[PDB]
Point group: C2
Chain length 249, copies 2
């Protein structure tokens, strides 16, 4: 199988990059690591594409430091994220939370793992009994911020059990995969923030969905990553779509 | 030091409690609560417990800080122990059992996580600061609106960001490490903050009321920051939420 060789190599790279990012903690680092990752992959697979518009070509979708604010603050959640898409479909994902030393991996059809341990999403379907994760965002536009908090307020209007935030899209999503959280939602993310972790959620038995309710669009700047379709749709139903410039357009 | 025997004993008790709490994650609140109280009473029969504060040696305990997290296996669940003599916190112990991080601090002797010394951050500019907070378990219309309002006001200053791991004690301990610059919340209780408060100040941080005045342990309010300048900027922007006190 060809793509299994790519994954083994990607896990090697993600750990190599993670150690570099965590050494730095112990920005210039982000450029330094992305160049290293792209150069490494190009030296082994020179016919592949990269993002940091998606064609059917084997493509590497890289976020060398997911959680840049965390990185600056030494807040213990900083991730290296690598997603691999063939025929516009994610085939495997790698998310290495380096401070945690947690290597999240998932291959299409083979399930999702954290450091060799099988991951399964939670069973919860009642949004009233649900724990969510999200990020407030990097935009400070009063109109956007109001929308973000209103959605958060609306979800607190419903008696949800709670809302958490570790400052990382990929790790927030990985926490859904472990079952620790029931669902994740955010508007303002980019494809490189979620391409690695999306497949880890779905291979944990989760679902990816657009906040409109429709199918998850990798370039929409929007994502719901839930444990099941029931909880995802309820979230989509309750929050309001925020207009934002698409990744391809 | 007579209270050093108390602290050594308290750390062992916390880890034991944490072992039981995490084991069930892989009723519990009652078991651990009874475990701790019956253990300290058998060693120190005349000490007080809270979970009103006299000069008497008093243990302020939270057997499971992060109840929601516990139910959801969200990997932040703490055992918090504060110990007060003469109405002032002498030592504090916070054990985050999922991540196996034992936070400890004795007044005057510094703050530690797994025997590794802690130091708060240097940041004084609030627009370059990372805050931690908690939206609380309260679903009161007047409260929830004011909570998100206060958060909006701080987020629009703007701050570098806001985080939430779902535990007052662990949020505060993250301030002690330097990973976060400040913690704030209204709606907490003395037992949520008694253990972590001294860990912040021994890491070099400050405790403060949202009014800008001295920290009041029974007031339901708290700002645990790296320094006075950052704490006061937070107090300045925050609207005080009315709540019944712990000693009322």
């Amino acid at each position: 199988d060809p793509w299994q060789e790519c994954m083994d190599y990607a896990v090697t790279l993600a750990r190599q990059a993670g150690e570099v990012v965590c050494e730095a903690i112990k920005t210039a680092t982000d450029q330094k690591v992305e160049k290293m990752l792209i150069s490494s992959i190009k030296e082994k697979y020179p016919s592949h594409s990269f993002i940091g518009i998606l064609t059917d070509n084997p493509t590497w979708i890289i976020d060398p430091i997911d959680g840049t604010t965390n990185f600056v603050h030494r807040f213990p959640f900083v991730a290296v994220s690598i997603g691999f898409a063939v025929n516009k479909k994610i085939e495997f994902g790698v998310v290495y939370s380096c401070v945690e030393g947690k290597m999240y991996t998932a291959r299409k059809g083979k399930g999702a793992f954290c450091n060799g341990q099988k991951l399964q999403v939670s069973q919860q379907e009642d949004i009233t009994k649900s724990l969510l994760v999200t990020e407030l965002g990097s935009s400070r536009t009063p109109e956007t911020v109001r929308m973000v908090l209103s959605n958060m307020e609306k979800l607190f209007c419903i008696p949800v059990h709670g809302i958490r935030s570790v400052g990382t899209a990929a790790v927030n999503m990985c926490l859904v995969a472990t079952g620790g959280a029931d669902a994740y939602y955010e508007m303002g993310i980019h494809c490189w923030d979620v391409a690695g972790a999306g497949i880890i959620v779905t291979e944990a038995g989760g679902v990816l969905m657009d906040v409109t309710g429709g199918p998850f669009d990798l370039m929409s700047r929007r994502v719901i990553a839930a444990n099941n379709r029931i909880l995802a749709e309820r979230i989509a139903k309750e929050i309001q779509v925020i207009p934002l410039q698409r990744d391809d357009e």
